[PDB]
Amino acid sequence: PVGARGPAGPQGPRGDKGETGEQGDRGIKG
């Protein structure tokens, strides 16, 4: 009889941390 199928591979790598948000709106003027 053929051997059993192997176990699943390891979990894949983690994604990178997301990018920082964009700069906020310019303040109201003087």
Partner 1 sequence: AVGPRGPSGPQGIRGDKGEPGEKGPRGLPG
Q: Minimum CB separation from partner 1 for residue 7, in Å?
A: 5
> In angstroms, what is the minimal distance from the CB of 3 to partner 1?
3
**Residue 26 CB, nearest distance to partner 1 (Å)?**
5
Positions in 1-30 near partner 1 (CB under 8 A): 1-30
Cα separation, 17 vs 13, in Å, equals 12
How far is 20 from 26, CA to CA, in rounded Å?
A: 18
Q: Determine which helix (DSSP H) or strand (DSSP E) holds 8, and give its type and residue range.
A: none
Q: Could you list the residues that contact partner 1 (CB under 8 A)?
A: 1-30
